[model samples]
Target: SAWPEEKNYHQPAILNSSALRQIAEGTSISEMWQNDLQPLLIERYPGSPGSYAARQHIMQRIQRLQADWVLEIDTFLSQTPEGERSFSNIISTLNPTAKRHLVLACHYDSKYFSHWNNRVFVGATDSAVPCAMMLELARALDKKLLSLKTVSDSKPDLSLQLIFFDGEEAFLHWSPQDSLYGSRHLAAKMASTPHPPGARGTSQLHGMDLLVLLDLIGAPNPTFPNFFPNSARWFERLQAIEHELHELGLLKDHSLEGRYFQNYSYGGVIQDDHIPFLRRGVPVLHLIPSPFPEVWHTMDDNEENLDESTIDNLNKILQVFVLEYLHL
Candidate 1:
């Protein structure tokens, strides 16, 4: 599990302004959030109309982005102490046979609160932005990744997987039994699943190179503290890239240089969808805003609550990070 020390590190080339601008222009994160995500702001409780409809909507977009990619809707039945339930997890991938792959994941469902029956908590930053960001990443990287596979004589070196988990929020109350329904179920399932022949040195689930979960993004100058120390190298890499972008004067009107990353050696551990995988020995980077946005979990967590600048900044940063990591 040694990294940031055991492996020889190479400084990735700084991306030129032109390249950064191209990535930023191609990213549809904000568009998707405004047009596709924010409208479905109903009570997305599991098995509810809003939740079911959102699933169909998201799947359609994924298929339309790259029809050639493998798209799977995994529906698993779980028996909880409260009752028997079913959860669906949407997974799309370009290199299913790759020994290892990168997972970009987010929960699609908003919180369910009986007290807020009259109000709609859209959870824009809570996860709506994160989910849209996944779609944006998939769309932006799909052609490039597939091209890499086609040009290669062997299996592609980089594999990208996007996951949207259903029922992330609690149905009634937040607890181990109620919260994280989709992720918890999927994690256990993957743990027991068999790996393909090329999978080496680890189980199928453990073979995940890294799982980066995005939450509480899309706010102006949002802070992402390093939650899991094991994946701090990846987190630091993001910050370093941001610094490089800033040095080139690409970060417009952004004075809070160090805001994105807290001191890696110390930060609070967030209990989100990534926890299930992290507990299974998979390395995870929880990209959630520390202290959270003021509108978190409130009906005010709507589209207007998001800052366009922040959304654009995070999108471009992630776009660069993925391309750099995959060496595209």
Candidate 2:
């Protein structure tokens, strides 16, 4: 039985080429940044013109998806040494009250550098593409749930939470005090906040089954080595799904076979937004390339540098991973 008992959904586990292409190409992640997001976030340093407005724009995009549950975590006061400023993290949940959840996350904020004479570093691969992918996943999954509603109760096997973290970039430098402000704040909040009575999991932090962090995903020929031994199985599952998709002709660009997801094991630890969750015993899968892109953290990390084929291949694999995990 290739499909499991829980796989009684309207949609197929392996997305057809049209659906995969729709996710990968029909909606341009680069365009989302070049047009809607980048212009607003140009000068988005902490006190700069579009700093808070950039966060607002991100929340609006998620709201447009009309997810099952939307949560805005205020991290401005939490990150501020004076407790005066404010920044936020947007959390969108598919099965809002489900005790167990698989978390997908990306940091939407770009780094603020002063020494570069206020150059607007449009972080296309740094996170714009990753954020666009999250939005695309939310839209795709929402439609799957809607289609599944006609026959049976529209309940997921496990919940999915898409977190768009703000202030992931350091204001002064990449130090404990400046980096991952939103994640640091949210992790503490989730640790202290208990789940409602009778919930399946212990607490908010304990409720998360896996935290997959997406970063530097737009560049061509990027490699995602499994950072944690605990997540190696899941990473290999992604590889297996990619192989399945390739054999079925659902995935494209066979010329770059194996370049998309490198055949490697036990990559070094990455210090990303998932660190806060990982510290609390939540298993994390850091989906960042091992060697950071050459254009990373520079003005060159712009729309022109993104590779569409890379985005397409990864998107197909990710959609399949989510569908299979949920037994759709």
Candidate 3:
């Protein structure tokens, strides 16, 4: 299939000092690691107790922000290798009435392995850390994002949406049916589901400007390449943010050579949850690291595999990118 170049949407300008202050959550990222990463460090295989607790934690965290975020716990059952099991895709929409959205997503499910270390898999980078990062992004920009809803004439009405997918890990070997159980179901459902208050021809899928998905990140010395040309401009935006932060000496460790993002594009798209959404014609920006961490999918993929320096560095840069995109 060939894809012609097209401008997906308008590029937001670099934010002002007021916008800078909104992302103060960026600096404290390292400091909050202990508390933020604790609850998410459990084995969260789909339908397990750990999974339930993780979901509850995400829901409560969003509610605590009191940011008028609307939560949709989309629960359904699908056939997997083992049998039919339940899955939940936690969807939270800020400024729920907005017609356009920038969706940030990550899978909350951890792989289950019977033989590996007593079946203990926390999936810190495979990925529980990404979930924590999303939660932190919401906290960092919640107030600014909410304030946009009240003023009708100030700017574009694009809002932020989060999707924490369940059942991302396969029960056995990976296959179309066994993998992406949550994303596959959710993508199809959203395609047909209309937004009641949206404009003509608007459905849940139609409302998204882009879906930036994070996966297998938070590891030390990770590198991200631009996967799809359609989303290359957005990827470049992220690179620019990382560089600018580094240049300003905002990054604590100046000696760290190079950055997490790459300037080149890699054509071979590694399969993940984005496949379902991309096939449905949604523009997607994938932020997963290439040459995945050595501990990927293993019990060692726990918090110990994570680099606090990298986490703090990404936290600051990602917050800056989000604010610039919204032009707060």
Candidate 4:
């Protein structure tokens, strides 16, 4: 799980050792900044990057996977819930799990802006990086899933669920009702199931061992936003892993600590997908970034605002966590 000490894993390609290392050291952003990863604030994406383009982009990916289709999104408002709204897609795979199933997820929706310096809301750092990470992670997990299936005669150790959520960002700003539509839906579905494969018939998903929710990890100073009081020990373990990565010179300084770590129970009490799962009694880990820069919801959010060191560190931290989780 240790990073190779040097590599570039961010050139829009499949996952590799370098990518794993970078993911394993994900907290470098936090070590640098003390806020949310704000791509729009930083100037990576520009304009209100139309919903049609983003929606179509994800729709195509789901169709290609040949995973079961839950619903189609047509007519922005038509394809949504009564009060909640979004062009959401749901895909699930039930692979036998001697290995724990990890949910790799992100919100694809951006925001509408009203800033003097910036007009459009681009979510490059806020979520694009996390989405990209999931893409690479998916490619890797797909291979793992295949390997596990082939060895079904001998129980496999882990399973994975990758989810790209639409509408995690709210209309005005973060809100209880406006946020987490996709996660709430997914949780409802999981809860309704008579028996989740790995849970041995547990009604609630609490039977599942873990929940790693990746949000704004694509920033110069990515921070672990909300730290649950009960999960402080879990955070300690992650910090310890980050320290190791930093010591090996595989990560940036931010991975050591971030702003959100100041809470007794949780800082910001962020309204995100992880909350739904936690409410369902699942142990959750919410990974976010730092500074939530002023460009967060602005057209100024562009690629120039990115930090290679932070991205590299992020890849390493997550990679290390996964490797350790699997005892690799």
The best candidate by TM-score is 3
Candidate 1 minimal-lDDT segment of 10 residues: 1-10
Model 4, 54-75: lDDT tens digits are 5554455444543232333322
Q: lDDT by residue for model 3 over 1-328, one digit each (tens)?
A: 0011112656867865444544543456753575556799998898889999999988988888857889999999887777888899999988777667788999999999765646588898987888998888787677776776576676776778999999988899888888999999999988887753644555677677789999998788888988888888889988877776666566655343657888777767688888998998889999988888889877788777788778777887777877777776
User: What lDDT is reached at residue 161 by model 3?
Assistant: 90
Instruction: Name every residue pair that clashes in candidate 1.
Output: none
Highest lDDT: which candidate? 3
Give the range where candidate 4 is weakest over 10 consecutive residues by summed lDDT.
2-11
Per-residue C-alpha lDDT of model 2 across residues 1-328, encoded as one tens digit per residue? 1112222222324555565545444444455545453544365655555666766766676666644455655655654543445667878776555555678899877776545665568687878788777766665566654443233355444657888887788766577887888899889888877654455435677667778899988887787776777677778777776776676665556544555566675435667898889888888878899788889988888877878767767776786677656555
TM-scores, one per candidate: 0.87, 0.82, 0.92, 0.67
TM-score of 3: 0.92
- Alpha-carbon shift of residue 91 in model 2 (angstroms): 1.0
1 or 4, greater by lDDT: 1
Model 4, residue 295: what's the lDDT? 57
lDDT of residue 157 for candidate 4? 39
Please estimate how well model 2 matches the true structure, expressed as its whole-model Cα lDDT. 0.68
List where candidate 4 sits over 4 angstroms from the true fold.
1-86, 92-100, 114-119, 140-146, 152-157, 197-201, 252-268
Weakest ten-residue segment in model 2 by summed lDDT: 1-10
Residue-level error in angstroms, candidate 2, position 94:
2.2
Cα lDDT of model 1 by residue, 85-104, tens digit: 77788887767775566788
* Candidates by lDDT, descending order: 3, 1, 2, 4
Residue 74 Cα positional deviation in candidate 1, in Å, after optimal superposition? 1.7
Each model's lDDT comes to 0.73, 0.68, 0.80, 0.52
